[PDB]
Amino acid sequence: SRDPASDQMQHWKEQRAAQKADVLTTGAGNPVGDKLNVITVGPRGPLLVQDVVFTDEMAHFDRERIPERVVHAKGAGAFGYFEVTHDITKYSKAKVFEHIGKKTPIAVRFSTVAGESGSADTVRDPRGFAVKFYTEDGNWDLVGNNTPIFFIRDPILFPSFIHSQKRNPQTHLKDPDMVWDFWSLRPESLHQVSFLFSDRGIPDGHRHMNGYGSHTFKLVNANGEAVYCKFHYKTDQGIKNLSVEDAARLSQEDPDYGIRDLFNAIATGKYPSWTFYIQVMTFNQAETFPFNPFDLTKVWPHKDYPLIPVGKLVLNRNPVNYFAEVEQIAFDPSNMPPGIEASPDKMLQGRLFAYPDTHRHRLGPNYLHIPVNCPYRARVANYQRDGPMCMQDNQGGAPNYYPNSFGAPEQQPSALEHSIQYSGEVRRFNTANDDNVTQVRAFYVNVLNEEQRKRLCENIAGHLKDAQIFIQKKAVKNFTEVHPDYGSHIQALLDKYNAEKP
Amino acid sequence: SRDPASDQMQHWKEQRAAQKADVLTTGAGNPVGDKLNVITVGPRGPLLVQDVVFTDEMAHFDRERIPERVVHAKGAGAFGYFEVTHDITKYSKAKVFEHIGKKTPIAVRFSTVAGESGSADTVRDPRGFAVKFYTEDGNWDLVGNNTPIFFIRDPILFPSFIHSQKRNPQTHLKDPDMVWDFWSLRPESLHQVSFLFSDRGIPDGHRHMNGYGSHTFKLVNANGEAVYCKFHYKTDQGIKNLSVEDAARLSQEDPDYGIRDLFNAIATGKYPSWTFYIQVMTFNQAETFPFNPFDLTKVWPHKDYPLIPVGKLVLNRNPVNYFAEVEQIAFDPSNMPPGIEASPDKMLQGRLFAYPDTHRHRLGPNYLHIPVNCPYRARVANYQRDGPMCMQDNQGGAPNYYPNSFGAPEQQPSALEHSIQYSGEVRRFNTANDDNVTQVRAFYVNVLNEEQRKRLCENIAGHLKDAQIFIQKKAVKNFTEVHPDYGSHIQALLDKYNAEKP
Amino acid sequence: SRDPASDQMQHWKEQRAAQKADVLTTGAGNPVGDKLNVITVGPRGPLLVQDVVFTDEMAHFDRERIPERVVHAKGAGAFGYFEVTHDITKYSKAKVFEHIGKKTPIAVRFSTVAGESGSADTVRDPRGFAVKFYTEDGNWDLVGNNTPIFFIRDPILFPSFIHSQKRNPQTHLKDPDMVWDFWSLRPESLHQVSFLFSDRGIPDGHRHMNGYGSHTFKLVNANGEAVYCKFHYKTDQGIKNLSVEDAARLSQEDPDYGIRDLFNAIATGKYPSWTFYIQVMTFNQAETFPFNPFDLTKVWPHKDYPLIPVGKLVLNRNPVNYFAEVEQIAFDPSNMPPGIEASPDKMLQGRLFAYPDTHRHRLGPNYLHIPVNCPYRARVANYQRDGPMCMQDNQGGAPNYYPNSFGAPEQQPSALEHSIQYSGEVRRFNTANDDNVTQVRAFYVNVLNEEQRKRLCENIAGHLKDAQIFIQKKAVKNFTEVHPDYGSHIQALLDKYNAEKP
Amino acid sequence: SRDPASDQMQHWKEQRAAQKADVLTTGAGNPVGDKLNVITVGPRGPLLVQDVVFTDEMAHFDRERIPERVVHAKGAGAFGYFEVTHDITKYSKAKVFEHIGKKTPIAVRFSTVAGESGSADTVRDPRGFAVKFYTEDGNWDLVGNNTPIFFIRDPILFPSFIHSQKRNPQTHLKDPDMVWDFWSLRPESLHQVSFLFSDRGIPDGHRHMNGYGSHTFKLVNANGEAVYCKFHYKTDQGIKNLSVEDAARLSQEDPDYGIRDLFNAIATGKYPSWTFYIQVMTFNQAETFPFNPFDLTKVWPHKDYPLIPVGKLVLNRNPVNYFAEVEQIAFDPSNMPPGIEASPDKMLQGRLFAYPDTHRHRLGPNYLHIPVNCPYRARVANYQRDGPMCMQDNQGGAPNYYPNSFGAPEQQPSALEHSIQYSGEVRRFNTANDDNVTQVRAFYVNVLNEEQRKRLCENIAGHLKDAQIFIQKKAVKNFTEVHPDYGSHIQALLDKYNAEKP
């Protein structure tokens, strides 16, 4: 007996036990006499069209692949539940938080950002930590990262950021000039670049990392009072990171390290958990916060905004079929039940549009009817009809226009969004020259020790050495603005690497 | 109270009765506070992206349409059953025929051929009469027409035939030159053109027409003995046709005449039935038949090949949702359970390829999992996985390769196809100059009376008058070869029409 | 010789003249020996897979259909130019208006709203009048109707409105209960319902109708000063309408009446033109306008806001291939060059999202590279890459992220949008009970004469008679609020129809 | 200055030189004022829908990914030419071979088989070596491998073979049980497994490997005389292989090793070439060949069937855009000009269907109009019309049905396929127990030396050690049947590995 992952097929055979093999059918349920040989004109003759077993099978094989996610393509999934352990109903009327001990089923997908489907798990990247909560008020998708911040604060830069992180459009090679040209020109990236090149840039699998919603959200209570919050889901297995050397070894030996680690943990009963916290900021505190509290390059310091515990995430179930439950799962940040709403974080606003839009391409118009995406603890009743691969009854003969005089579904005024007044012109406001260094300096000085600062600078220099000198210069200038020792330590390592380079 | 079709919504409201209206949700099951107004910056300001209710709804609306069927776009559907009334188990081991009184659920779609989705029902065209039998050996699709024959005997001509019958590629107008240039150049069309322009060219709705499989199929019994057969499903409501004048009136007044007629019949308990017959021809009779018995332009005369009764088709249920059950239904002639097989009819061979192929485009790779297409009285177990809009479990963790040592599904040797030897070179054989007139003459002389011959010639002349003279000449030449009176009567009417034409 | 439309193929043959027929090829340019017969095992044997001519052809045929437009499916197209005849550069810096006599190529598609692809042209409906201007500042799509107003003033009602106008979801029949339940519940529809049921509800083909942008747009001049405008394009062939009786006759005799009329006009040199006007309203006039000037159910009266002439639209070219140039053409109201911008008309704001969204489904992600949609008088240079059916070079090896240090395309600050301040909370504002009758009364009393009022009431009663009495009552109540004689005349006709009804 | 691949962007900037940056446009060619910031309601307000720059860009980004190839996903491409150096016009009338020194442009894609898009180049796998020849008789796709043979001889096993080589359907991990269960049950795989686990299982990039057509094809000369042939394209750079240790290192250090190697070779003028040979076998030799000459698990020994030189393949051009020219390129083995035809190799027959079928899914119906796939040295003229993303003119107003009387394209009887008679029943013939060992033994004994046999057995044992013992036993049994020393050496290494395993 090996690890449970290695024994998947042996275990499947054992569960079947005395059961006779199912009859092998075509897609249309017609039994197949022989699937090992095609119909030919005698033993050395050509293949006949009336071999429909062959064509049925081959035509399906020809269509197996769907587009990979534009980002976060390489992932691992698992199922479990969220349990409420504390009352936050003062902040949010959301049914998911309704009472202590209320259990909600969840689905999680962990991912890297830039790698395609066949890429290695144990690489330096932000990790995605997406959680789908199947509530009675519909699905809530908290599409988090393993970092509280991001590289950019305006969503129109997102495609450019991802392009710079992916392959050269001509050579199809990863390109340090592209990576560092973009970051050196957009110094709002320094905070997340500091996190990325620190030890938590390569977690030891998915169980040993935190998740964050990253954005400011808005909680609304039963009295219609709103606060702003951040969501934090801190690992109960403890933070653990791979060394650059072990990460490199594993990238070759076990490209699927994270998938295997998580599958084996859950298969052997070692159910990974995370403690779910919020930070709360009142609308008055948002007016007086030293930065933009809706700026995705900024945290809320823990002294001013302590973590309020809410509940626990537990993953206790592996997917039965990876394609059905992990490849096809879709998280939309716009899937927010009543009591949880978007802040005006510009990055969150962009994500409200982009995810349903990419889901309709990647999966199809009716992707919310794929079982893993279905809000199966809610009744879907609306005026939406048809579209390709329409499953179930398409809401039967129910009236398909609103308003109507025939008793079809009705708006629920309690589900109405929280209203705010906003001051200013409708236009494009520059946020490039918001504060790019203050919190990065707090991280470098107050959070990292001396050993950690040395590895941070070694990890950066090792990547940045491959960029052109003009890019190295602009990158080091930005690091120097954080702290002279940050910049100078990087420049010192670059001088060594650029000298070795013929 | 009006006809049941007109009262669809009133009846839906009545069934709901005391029930409170369902809560109006987004696709992800999140309740909607207000679906009558969008979120704006004050009462005369611009629309906000965070109006995801608006975007969810509008994005679905934007994707409602799927491609129409390349042919037979305009249709009416209904459900019911096939009941065996006689034993043909001597001819076929097919479970659908297994014992007297065995009931199998069916789905039927009636259609015209050339009209697009918004076109009129009461036009001159062949009608499609497609029957899906949900058997325990998987689905059997008998994709029949309201005529025993077709216009062509080689499938490589099918796209050309349909192009000639549809719109001019530049003007987007129906084009008599295209229609009659093609038919006049391909005189194998005379038999089906004679049927088309006779009284049965415009049935009085779907209940008053026969269906035919048209092709020769092969029945195989439990001893592995094969015969050839034709399938005939003769209306129990009796043949009834619209006059050209009534057909024209209805095309304007009731474009959906056939849909309405069928829906109202079933809603008022007038359940239309058809008697299901076979004709049988032994392999020896196939050697000695005066024509090619696999030629789709030929019938088997009833004196030599009498109708053997088998069962009854009954339609007793309307679709609950037209899009879900009629627009999305897919019939594949290649869906044949054991005991029923393709003959070497070249046209049937082409159809073995074309239908699954168009279904994967029109509906999607996984179109067999759409509920109306699902073989729900059979267990589908095979090595096919994934593809877009993968529903159910994608066969869970079952081994996905064959052969395997882990107890996944197994071929069933009893389901093996019937073997035949064929004589000749593998090449393209010309069938253009097979007999194009003998059976057409039998129809003109022995089956039509004098009144019927007059209307046949008036219906043809009225269409053919719009073609160029050179096409009229070639068309009349072919009609003359059937019978001098056929040709001369048409030429006489054309002389009258061409004289009136300035 | 017949009409030019009827002679399309004869004319094509004549242009070819002495030229030998092209060699018939597969899709991959391989010459075809025989396309009239398939490869079989001898003359009565089965079809071979190695017949790739057959499969290449059939597989293409299987994929011919794309989804029809969700609305405005049935259309006619033509090409020509817009010519400036007056200076409006005081109002707009748009290059399309730059100097007198400046010619810009245009594409136009005329359509009905509710009919599917095979439906009749000569039916009561609004007509679409979409104009694409191929300018040097990219395409400008003015996606107009043959009416200055619409049935609704909030875009979240659009899918419901279109559902109510299309087929019952169960029966697939047009449903007067659905049509009149929706209109009777949404009396903002009265203005466009009055226009719809008047004589201009059935134009005599496309050449004899006006087009309107319908929405308020914003013009911005070279000094950055903004006004609001309406666009009007008045027929130079004069308004002409079909009688209900002639419209009904033509629906049967010539379903493609509008396509044929337009094709024949342009083929015979009778080039239809429209005079292009604007109405202008200053930002101060917008503050003091008695209604919401951004309300799509309201006109700007001509006395207060006279038509300022701008130029002339001329259609002088037929499409060479209908599918390539009319079926595949896509108009996005969001395609606005500098000098032309969206007003805060809520309906226009909805249309900014919906059209690119439906285009990516109906045509594909890269639909702007389809030749008729390509901005071929502008250089497209940006950071967009890849997507299915990527044509041209995908911008070669150009840097694919912004900002960059490598000289790839740069933002043009002169192309920056006009900034405005808006007052109020971000929320859903009810507009149902805005004024629904004032301008409708002006139309009934001041614009229609006595004969026209009689036909208006006869046309409404003839449709509304089929709705349930409770709907008839609510409909008549709303008509009565416009004018007692409007309501009473309709009720009188209904009493007659409801008495005849058993 | 670095390697040319690293300098892609610097070189692009240099070519631009004094040229001003292009203006940044939307997809519709409208200039963009600012692409660095979105439109918001004041500086901390929500995002507006009328930010169409944002939506245009984001919507395109959302749709960038197309499905990866179902197999051979990870690839490198290049362009060049084929030059004829010898006369084989006695064997083939194909224009590509017409006269000595005739140059034909080519496109090549090199690939591994099982890896997804982000996987490492330097792994043990067969390599794809696909060549597209743009001839005047249309495209010829020679879709070859770096091995003359394959693992299976019946195409209905292909999906199972690829499934066994890819990820476990539940765990999404590579599974040695799946790999070796399949191979141990299908011992026809021994020949290609022996090649795979030998030194040529990991070439040193694409320039240092041979290509083979693998299948028997049929050459037909101007007199209509047919022979059978194999195509061989032997590297002029010489065979060179990575050691397992270097391959493992490079998999981590340079996942894109093969892409980089090839791009840098061509960028520095080191244009890789291959010598193109045929082996010829007459129809009489095919009758008397000791094996099935159409069996893809068998070679034609060089002594009996010497290599006849034909020409040279040269790659002298890199792709300008990888997505446009390498990701979107499609090779169909069915794209064969006159003079080259399919043999009855069952595997080739399956490939005649599968490639156009997967291309219509992966790329779209009109994938042959993507510039890299276009037969641009041939005139495409046929009766195929429409389909999504129809580019060019869709053949204008040409008649769209065949036959016609209007001078549209005509079949070319010289392009007719070669006719053969075949003996036997139309049925499924078992080929599992064809000879599985004779040629494998010739390889083990006569072609490998002692050092090579040792590495062969070490490479197999290192993979097979991870399979269950029952699979190891069945695998070793099959190796023993090749040669007792083959089996025993593997069993010896397994005993060592299975002892180390706790």
UniProtKB/Swiss-Prot annotation, chains A, B, C, D:
Active site, renumbered: H72, N145
Modified residues (Phosphoserine): S6, S414, S419
Binding annotation for heme: Y355
EC number of the protein: 1.11.1.6
Disease: Acatalasemia: A metabolic disorder characterized by a total or near total loss of catalase activity in red cells. It is often associated with ulcerating oral lesions. Acatalasemia is inherited as an autosomal recessive trait.
PANTHER family named among the record's database cross-references: CATALASE
Function: Catalyzes the degradation of hydrogen peroxide (H(2)O(2)) generated by peroxisomal oxidases to water and oxygen, thereby protecting cells from the toxic effects of hydrogen peroxide. Promotes growth of cells including T-cells, B-cells, myeloid leukemia cells, melanoma cells, mastocytoma cells and normal and transformed fibroblast cells.
Annotated protein name in UniProt: Catalase
Species annotation: Homo sapiens
Gene transcribed to yield this protein: CAT
